[PDB]
Write a protein that binds this ligand. Structure first.
Ligand code: HEM
Ligand SMILES: [Xe]
Ligand SMILES: [Xe]
Ligand SMILES: [Xe]
Ligand SMILES: [Xe]
Length: 154
């Protein structure tokens, strides 16, 4: 699926991202929660927050951003090892299905926001090959997370 060079393009860009994983990750989630306020129903501490300026200062938001960024870090850094990606993504899916009861589609939506922000951030380093690499990564995330929702009885 993901080629050598495509793996390498994602990984090189992810490293530039992760150098401010904390700012990037909350910016992403703030954007997500601003543009899809329905997604915020699952978070006790900011379900009724509207102000982006407050959302950005929320510890529960910031914690989720840090944990999402950590999981995807595991995925991106280990794209060469398909079994560590399956297991990370299966843990995540199952958790979201059962612990948190999150509709799977919000994964699609969040991923679209991620892609929007990565494109903005690397606008001067986003050639078709690199767009393709990210699109495949996004699609692979959704497959494994979908498969996990089915495995558990969603
Ligand atoms: C790439 C996509 C995502 C990843 C990798 C991810 C990962 C995680 C991780 C590692 C945790 C902490 C461990 C756990 O409690 O399961 C967590 C917690 C949580 N996640 Fe996500 N998540 C993602 C997307 C989402 C989405 C789309 C939602 C809902 C719209 C969501 C809702 C929650 C909730 C409600 C918690 C518990 C938060 C808390 O206890 O404060 N996650 N997530
Ligand atoms: Xe994120
Ligand atoms: Xe990612
Ligand atoms: Xe990201
Ligand atoms: Xe993504």
């Amino acid at each position: 699926e993901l080629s050598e060079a495509e793996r390498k393009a994602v990984q090189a860009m992810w490293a530039r991202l992760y150098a401010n994983s904390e700012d990037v990750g909350v910016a992403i989630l703030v954007r997500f929660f601003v543009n899809f306020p329905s997604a915020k129903q699952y978070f006790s501490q900011f379900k009724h927050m509207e102000d982006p300026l407050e959302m950005e200062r929320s510890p529960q938001l910031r914690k989720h951003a840090s944990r999402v960024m950590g999981a995807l870090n595991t995925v991106v850094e280990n794209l060469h090892d398909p079994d560590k990606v399956s297991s990370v993504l299966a843990l995540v899916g199952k958790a979201h299905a059962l612990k948190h009861k999150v509709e799977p589609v919000y994964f699609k939506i969040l991923s679209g926001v991620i892609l929007e922000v990565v494109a903005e951030e690397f606008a001067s380093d986003f050639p078709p090959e690199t767009q393709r690499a990210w699109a495949k990564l996004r699609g692979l995330i959704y497959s494994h997370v979908t498969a996990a929702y089915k495995e558990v009885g969603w």
